[PDB]
Amino acid sequence: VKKLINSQISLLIGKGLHEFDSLRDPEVNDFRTKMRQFCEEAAAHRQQLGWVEWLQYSFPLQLEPNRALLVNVKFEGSEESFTFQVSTKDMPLALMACALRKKATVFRQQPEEYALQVNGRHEYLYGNYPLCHFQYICSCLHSGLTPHLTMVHSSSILAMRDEQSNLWSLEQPFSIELIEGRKVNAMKLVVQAGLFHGNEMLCKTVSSSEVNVCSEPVWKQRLEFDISVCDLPRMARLCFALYAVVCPIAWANLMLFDYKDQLKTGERCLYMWPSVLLNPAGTVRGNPNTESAAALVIYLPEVAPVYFPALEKILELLREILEYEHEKDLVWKMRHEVQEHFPEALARLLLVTKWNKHEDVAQMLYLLCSWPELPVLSALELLDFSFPDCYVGSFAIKSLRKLTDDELFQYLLQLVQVLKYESYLDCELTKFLLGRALANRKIGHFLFWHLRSEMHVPSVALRFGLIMEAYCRGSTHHMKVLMKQGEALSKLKALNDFVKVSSQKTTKPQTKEMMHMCMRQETYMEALSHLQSPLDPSTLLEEVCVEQCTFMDSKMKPLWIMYSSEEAGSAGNVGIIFKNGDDLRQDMLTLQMIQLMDVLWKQEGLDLRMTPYGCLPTGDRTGLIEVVLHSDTIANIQLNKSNMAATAAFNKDALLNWLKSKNPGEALDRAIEEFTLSCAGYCVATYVLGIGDRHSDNIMIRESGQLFHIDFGHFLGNRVPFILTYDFVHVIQQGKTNNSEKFERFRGYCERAYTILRRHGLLFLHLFALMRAAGLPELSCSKDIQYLKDSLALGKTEEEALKHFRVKFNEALRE
Ligand SMILES: CC[C@H](Nc1ncnc2nc[nH]c12)c1nc2cccc(F)c2c(=O)n1-c1ccccc1
């Protein structure tokens, strides 16, 4: 009934729906009701999409950011295949008319009625783009492999669709009364309060009296702030630090206006969070661990039922050098000049805006509502917490709406982290994310896992749980596809626990055949088979190949799980790596950032042949990593074993002999080149990102020659030199001792890659800035972000920045 759906939702999101109701919170109840209706409405929009439109929804196109190729095409019901010779400039439709024509001239006698599906993948070829513009067609073109497509009729596509159906007056100073407190430590106690607007103070901080530490203390003391009530901005938050003195203890935050714009009065009790002192960016909701949390009771005086004013009320109420408070000055009362001729300097203007005086806010807000929509880049900036105003927030979302799904996919990790800055449940960002997720099934997929992966974190468990419930309201079908994934994940965790225990008392071979017998149980085989990969929903994991599964007998004992699809061929031969105990958040950001570099590089005609493999936290220190097959570790290669084709007279030849043995004849030149581009790319990626501890065990190489890094762990120096491994350098130089020709080719690739990224330095700064919200220990300060600015060197000219890169590069061929 409606009871099955709720029950599955509770199971899927890892928090029982009954818990939301137990809260008796009308903000929560109104979110669940408003957002439910919102998502149910998208669902009904979706179930009457035209078949091409539904293809777009469910299998969005994977495009790259003259020549002839061999193609193989069949139909759904058939087993019979045709192999054609088409161009690369040919549209998909051209391909489809060929297929249909030979179907006639084989079965005896309209392209528009079909789409092309990659065999064994939820991925399709359609639209007026030449074949080479397709990522699948491209991967094939570089691996020598032949594309395998299936002609799928609009009437079967329609089947899939249906299958998935379902006030200014108050001029007295702001003051609170600090009543009591409720938990203990070790000395005297102090409560520091601060009115904050984002990260800036609306006035001086105000402390309290000192009382003896034990208790359950009592102040009943009146804290009054240097700020009038009528000047409290909408998004103003009051922040408390509780600590000790002759020693940090707890913090807690509260909005002065509720989620209904009403100014807060009366007494409220604050269940604090443990520290290490004021913490303005911390969540504005209480600690859910009410049992053992210090509690802070305060009283907000009832200054009359005063609402924050409607906007209609609010609206009625040398300089280019800069592109000091003798500089703000001229930005602010030349504000109109900034709207006229510098509409992109909005951020700067909002920053010199004093937010502690209401009639200033109104004049900014008056300019804001007439402000021309801004570029995505600028928009990404405005989402930062340093622009806490809810109207700036809406402007930002509004300027963000022109995000393509690819861009949105690319930035989604950040946007999701920014949810932790939000002051209320119901907000524009969330509505924006659910709207986009419901419009694109891949976005939906990853929005879900980013939220799901943090349900063990109580700061966000409620917000994130609510958001997943709403989404689940929007696609009952995808919810079940997603449960399917989580039943797989649940199994791998129990499997991994077994292997960990087993391997502490048993040889590896015997634990492996033990792992296998466990996988062979009915329960496992069913749960682990026939799902979409959480790493990429267009990858289908069909039959788990048990004999090819194993584990690494290192540390966390990660699992190696292989799959096959008797209908995808070699494209269905795919693996996933499950790891439990390590924190995979660091690696996901790094590999996301490397993916972006790769895109930026490729849009300026530079392909450094990167391997940005999937990496996905799915839970508390739990996740999946994408298996890159036909690759081996440098360390393994460098072992220089006997009886191997790669066996070498000098250790430095090992890497190259291995390459020769995998790439005989004139195949060899291609692999050196791939090695060269990919090494260039990774050297630069790790330098900019400040990723040290790079060694032969966390660098791998593909039989094609491509090199790629793994297990990044940290980034941002937590100052890393550029590095150059002589062993890589001597693959690049083709085995030859000196080879400036081939060494400077590579120097060029490094420089070109470096300068290209430099040109997009603002994008990386904006993205990393928003990631501060994620709570990665490597990404906290301003000196973390300063690290990126120096590795990209944006405080300098392209000419002299290149000169600084050359010295570090040259210092790096030290070895
Ligand atoms: C750490 C190196 C390596 N990591 C990776 N191997 C393949 N694709 C990857 N994608 C990300 N990390 C990728 C690895 N990771 C594993 C993880 C779990 C279970 C395992 F058996 C392995 C394993 O055997 N290797 C391995 C080692 C030496 C050669 C070949 C593969």
Residue numbers in the entry: 109 to 173, 187 to 230, 235 to 291, 316 to 335, 339 to 398, 416 to 445, 452 to 479, 482 to 494, ...
What did the study's authors say about this model?
PI3Kδ is a class I PI3K that is formed by a catalytic subunit (p110δ) and a regulatory subunit (p85). Idelalisib (also known as GS-1101, CAL-101, IC489666, and Zydelig) is a PI3Kδ inhibitor that has recently been approved for the treatment of several hematological malignancies. Idelalisib is a potent and selective inhibitor of the kinase activity of PI3Kδ.
Idelalisib binds in the ATP-binding pocket. The ethyl group of the inhibitor binds in a hydrophobic pocket formed by Ile-910, Met-900, and Met-752. The phenyl moiety of idelalisib packs against the side chains of Asp-832, Thr-833, and Asn-836. The kinase domain and, in particular the ATP-binding site, is well defined by the electron density, but the Ras-binding and C2 domains have higher temperature factors and are more mobile, as are the residues that link the ABD and the Ras-binding domain. Overall, these observations support the idea that engagement of the specificity pocket upon kinase binding contributes to the selectivity profile of idelalisib.
